């Protein structure tokens, strides 16, 4: 019926000056563009249809052609940046923003979706969507007493589109836009739908990916406890963005990092640092490395939560990328820690898995490991116990690795390797 029309016929109907013939041809265009197998986006663009579709967004007396043209334009805008640009260049942003207030919820939702595709192209189109005024009416759709009264799909699309207005950098979204969105975003982050929770966390993750002033806007809204709860979710599509966000926040100030600790995040890391998904393990170890770069009382809280044995475990066996973050987390621990903290590392078994990694290739990890070894030896001295550590390094076959490191392209490796063999 409207199935498998040629572009030629679509064009004839759209050019017919009969609104009902235009509707059938727009539907036939929508069905072609709905096809997962290479939709003919470029053929539709070349046939000159975008400006007609945009004019159809304004036909308030024919809501079905508003819907069909919004859907066809959504799927053109879902393509490449050139394809999204064709939609923007036809005037679609203000026309979609006017449809946010449509009394037809399926049409309002389609306009939300299209504006998400447009804003998801990048920061320039995101900011252009913001400048045309999209935030006020999007937020008004969510200004209800209880989110649970909205249709599940409508809520998910609105959250997803808001997340694209939080996304991307160079520049980051305008500060006033972020402040305007946050209260609603924090409400979505307490909702019970797993897809809404996941997309909300992705949005918070985008907002905390930046300077400490961006982190602070977020932290000051009280989201860290809910992030910590979500970090314990069963569903990995929630854990993954919750963990990204927490990891971003601890790149900030010692005081922002302490909000994460105070909220209980460390108690989740036994699971995170043994998580069967490699990416979770890796991101959890990276986060640990920015916590052990904190204050000594923060290091002490790492120790108290029992996490030093979990870092030994990762050094001992993990994906090579995860092991390298573990090495960083240890080097940072040794650099900022007390003598008592540093010796505890050796008591937990750090030496042997550290040495076994000296036989790696990536020169960076060797420099990171060697810096830790040195920092540990310097703590041994303060106690008069360097010989005991020297023996350890020998019985595990460390010296063997350390000596051969002198034979390394990066003479920095060669420099440190030799210097240690010397003094010890």
């Amino acid at each position: 019926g409207t199935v498998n029309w040629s572009v030629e016929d679509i064009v004839k109907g759209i050019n017919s000056n009969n609104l009902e013939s235009q509707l059938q041809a727009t539907q036939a265009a929508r069905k072609l563009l709905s096809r997962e197998k290479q939709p003919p986006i470029d053929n539709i663009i070349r046939a000159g249809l975008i400006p007609k579709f945009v004019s159809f967004l304004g036909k308030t007396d024919c809501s079905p052609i508003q819907f069909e043209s919004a859907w066809a334009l959504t799927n053109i805008a879902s393509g490449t940046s050139e394809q999204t640009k064709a939609v923007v260049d036809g005037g679609a942003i203000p026309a979609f923003i006017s449809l946010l207030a449509s009394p037809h919820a399926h049409i309002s939702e389609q306009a939300v979706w299209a504006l998400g595709n447009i804003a998801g192209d990048g920061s320039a189109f995101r900011d252009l969507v913001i400048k045309h005024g999209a935030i006020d009416p999007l937020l008004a759709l969510l200004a209800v007493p209880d989110l649970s009264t909205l249709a599940c799909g409508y809520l998910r699309n609105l959250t997803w589109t808001l997340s694209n207005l939080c996304r991307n950098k160079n520049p980051a979204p305008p500060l006033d836009a972020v402040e305007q969105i946050l209260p609603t975003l924090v409400r979505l982050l307490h909702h019970n739908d797993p897809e809404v929770l996941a997309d909300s966390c992705w949005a918070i993750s985008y907002l905390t990916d930046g300077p400490n002033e961006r982190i602070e806007m977020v932290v000051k809204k009280g989201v860290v406890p809910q992030l910590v709860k979500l970090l314990g979710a069963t569903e990995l599509p929630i854990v993954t963005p919750a963990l990204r966000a927490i990891g971003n926040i601890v790149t900030g100030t010692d005081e922002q990092t302490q909000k994460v600790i105070d909220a209980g995040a460390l108690a989740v890391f036994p699971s995170l640092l043994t998580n069967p998904k490699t990416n979770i393990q890796k991101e959890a170890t990276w986060t640990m490395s920015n916590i052990t770069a904190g204050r000594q009382d923060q290091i002490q809280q790492v120790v108290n939560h029992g996490l030093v044995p979990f870092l030994v475990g990762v050094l001992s066996k993990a994906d090579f990328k995860t092991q390298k973050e573990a090495a960083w987390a240890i080097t940072n621990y040794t650099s900022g820690g007390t003598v008592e903290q540093i010796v505890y590392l050796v008591h937990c078994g750090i030496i042997e898995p550290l040495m076994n990694l000296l036989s790696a290739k990536d020169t960076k990890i060797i420099q990171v490991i060697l810096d830790a070894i040195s920092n540990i030896f310097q703590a041994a001295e303060k106690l008069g116990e360097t010989e005991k550590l020297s023996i350890m390094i020998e019985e595990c076959g460390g010296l063997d690795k350390i000596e051969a490191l002198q034979r390394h392209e990066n003479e920095s490796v060669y420099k440190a390797s030799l210097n240690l063999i010397e003094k010890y």
Binding site: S34, A77, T84, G116, N117, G120, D121, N164, R167
Partner: peptide
């Protein structure tokens, strides 16, 4: 997370 989404139904 997807930057863009096609509507297929």
């Amino acid at each position: 997370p997807n930057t863009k989404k096609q509507k297929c139904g």
